[PDB]
Design a protein around this ligand. Structure first.
Ligand code: HEM
Ligand code: HEM
Ligand SMILES: Nc1ccc(Cl)cc1-c1ncn[nH]1
Ligand SMILES: Nc1ccc(Cl)cc1-c1ncn[nH]1
Ligand SMILES: Nc1ccc(Cl)cc1-c1ncn[nH]1
Ligand SMILES: Nc1ccc(Cl)cc1-c1ncn[nH]1
Lengths: 371, 371
């Protein structure tokens, strides 16, 4: 595509993100890399309260401003959720609060671990001269041992890389519509469908590397935020930045541009209506990087691929379009079954509005089939 | 460009349609005699006796904007009735279905919206005269003595005064990239000139609106059903949705030209998770699609604010500040209007309203070039 910071190889992810900061900031990363055994010992909160306020004026490139936001975001999650059994810190220490916020609002992100931090900037290749498989990859940061966070972040990133392969044929879709290149558009839409289809096969790998009683009971709590949470009723205080507490939702895959872009490409207005789902997905855009909003906004301001394919009466076109929407329905319906496996049944051993929420998005997707 | 802009009237609808196809005479009669039907108590009767008219005989965009305006005023008149408290909670099928079908086609919620009752609700008496209050009028009003002509036309007149600055928005972004310091100064000054002229047109609101008529009559018919005690969980659109849906009443926050200058001047009115940032973002779902595409696409370009901040140019900075100073004066003068037309009439039988508008103005003066 364009300078929207989209890689041809990994798409919206950060290509080969940085693992080490300037040693100026080694006080920070010492904490982050040893979080699994700093939380167990009741000494993570104390060592955070010890650190003195470092300045953000020495983050040179963009790749280490991201790495900094990941470290500062992972510490912030570990500090406020503690061991994970209902002990909550409602005020973030001053000497890490204002470094987190000063950086965050220079990348136009909210001061909390978002999807682009802990997934897109949170990976590396085992052998740098090797492909992109679950074997040859490893996550840079985890919360506590045995939380399956390496499985969760990676297979989510792997299908992100899988679907993002279709991003570089989006410009083909829009210009085939402009020059009336029917055959090109048809092949373009078919290629998009093959990517969303194989992004579902990569999505099967979650049964192998994430365990339900693990995800629900440890990794869920560290990825929660302080927006509409009874544990942090009025939000979290960023000491020294805002005197009042600020609310921010936790990390979500709805904060991925790849996963929202195909809905606006195919003309599925998932943001239309006053529904809680249409509202959530819109709010989650301000939790995406700025170049990633501008890409979704630019897709919105293009002629509807749907209404174009609708007007042609082309049974070939209308099947290639229906192929893409069937791939999103299958993904969302298979995604519904794992929510039964990884939230519903673990919670058994309120929560019914979650399935309604997701079924709302699936139904709107499935109500966009042409024929 | 293609954002459906007008050289003279801007984001307003250029010379809207005054009549619909005689197929829809059943609708047009109810809208054109809205005060008489409500005054006699026979409006809800003639709406229930309506047959379902297919929206298919509405081809032109202008004939669809007129129908949205007609159906919207009838809808507002049906729900509120006499406006004294006896509200209807179910919108009859024979108007709810054509309403929602048309709203779907135009990507707007099924409720009366600024783009209907201001941008599409006006007429030029003499085509050879200028766009002045004595040359213009409205198409549809709610009650007798509701001062609908004043409120809508003063707003529409202000919208045109500010839209005269939209044509130099590409000049500002052209000059920033080609590094043309002179024309960027001239362009910024021209923007500040138009905004200060809009404040002068805004003064007419004292002449054609009176506080009692607005607060007691017109304000009622603009109220929606989102977060309202009288319609707890929305409105029934019979035959189109099994469940009631919530939607917000009309607001000038639904106007793009009033949100765009904040976006242009780098004044992030939408950053953070505050109520004000949320409300203004929520209102973009109430603007025409091409109008809300223009807002976020302005967010894509490099920020005019940080560019002026780097150039250490007492000329540039004084010109950039002049625009921000014009917004702060418009927003502060608007607060004197609110207390006259809402707060004071409330005191002859509120705060969260003021604290929103104070927060929005406070965010603008934070953008004054001293930080
Ligand atoms: C244990 C595994 C998973 C669980 C329990 C789960 C659960 C959920 C929940 C609760 C939501 C509601 C929105 C929110 O609360 O953030 C959601 C939405 C969503 N999830 Fe997941 N999820 C899982 C794995 C994944 C993965 C691996 C992906 C993609 C790589 C994904 C993609 C999405 C998307 C795109 C949405 C937005 C709604 C939509 O697009 O239909 N999920 N999921
Ligand atoms: C009787 C006269 C008026 C009253 C009582 C009034 C009241 C209000 C209210 C209640 C809001 C908050 C938004 C909402 O609650 O929906 C608001 C905001 C706003 N008003 Fe008005 N209004 C009046 C006239 C006007 C006019 C003629 C304009 C024309 C430009 C205008 C421009 C705006 C704008 C742009 C906002 C959005 C907030 C902002 O941009 O700062 N108002 N006003
Ligand atoms: N796949 C994910 C990866 C990272 C984060 Cl922070 C959240 C998710 C997710 N949110 C909803 N479902 N899955
Ligand atoms: N919308 C989605 C919902 C759930 C899952 Cl698992 C994936 C997607 C998606 N994949 C590509 N685009 N969107
Ligand atoms: N000026 C307006 C014109 C039409 C409608 Cl529906 C609302 C407003 C307004 N809302 C808040 N302030 N002004
Ligand atoms: N932001 C505003 C708030 C209140 C009023 Cl009355 C006008 C404006 C405005 N006019 C042109 N741009 N902005």
């Amino acid at each position: 595509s364009k300078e929207y910071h989209i890689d041809e190889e990994v798409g919206f992810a950060l290509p080969n993100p940085q693992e080490n900061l300037p040693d100026f900031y080694n006080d920070w990363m010492f904490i982050a890399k040893h979080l699994p055994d700093l939380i167990e010992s009741g000494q993570l909160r104390e060592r955070v309260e010890k650190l003195n306020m470092l300045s953000i004026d020495h983050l040179t490139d963009h790749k280490s401003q991201r790495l900094a936001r990941l470290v500062l975001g992972c510490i912030t999650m570990a500090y406020v959720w503690g061991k994970g059994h209902g002990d909550v810190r409602k005020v973030l220490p001053r000497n890490i609060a204002v470094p987190y916020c000063q950086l965050s609002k220079k990348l136009e992100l909210p001061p909390i671990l978002v999807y682009a931090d802990c997934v897109l900037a949170n990976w590396k290749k085992k052998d740098p001269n090797k492909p992109l498989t679950y074997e040859n990859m490893d996550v840079l940061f985890s919360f506590r041992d045995g939380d399956c966070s390496k499985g969760f972040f990676l297979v989510s990133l792997l299908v992100e890389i899988a679907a993002a392969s279709a991003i570089k044929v989006i410009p083909t879709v829009f210009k085939a519509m402009q020059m009336q290149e029917r055959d090109t558009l048809l092949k373009a839409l078919l290629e998009i469908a093959s990517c969303l289809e194989k992004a579902l096969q990569v999505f099967h790998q979650i049964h192998d590397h994430v365990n339900p009683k693990a995800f629900f009971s440890v990794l869920r709590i560290y990825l929660s935020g302080w927006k509409g949470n009874p544990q942090l009723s009025d939000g979290l205080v960023y000491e020294g930045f805002w005197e009042d507490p600020k609310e921010f939702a936790g990390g979500s895959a709805g904060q991925s541009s790849v996963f929202q872009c195909f809905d606006v490409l195919l003309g599925i207005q998932q943001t239309a209506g006053g529904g809680h789902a249409a509202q959530f997905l819109q709010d989650m855009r301000r939790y995406m990087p700025p170049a990633h909003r501008n890409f979704l906004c630019s897709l919105e301001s293009n002629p509807s691929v749907r209404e174009f394919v609708l007007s042609k009466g082309d049974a070939g076109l209308r099947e290639a379009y229906d192929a893409c929407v069937k791939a999103l329905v299958s993904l969302r319906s298979y995604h519904l079954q794992i929510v039964t496996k990884y939230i519903l049944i673990p919670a058994s051993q309120g929560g019914t509005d979650l399935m309604n929420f997701l079924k709302t998005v699936r139904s709107t997707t499935e109500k966009s089939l042409l024929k």
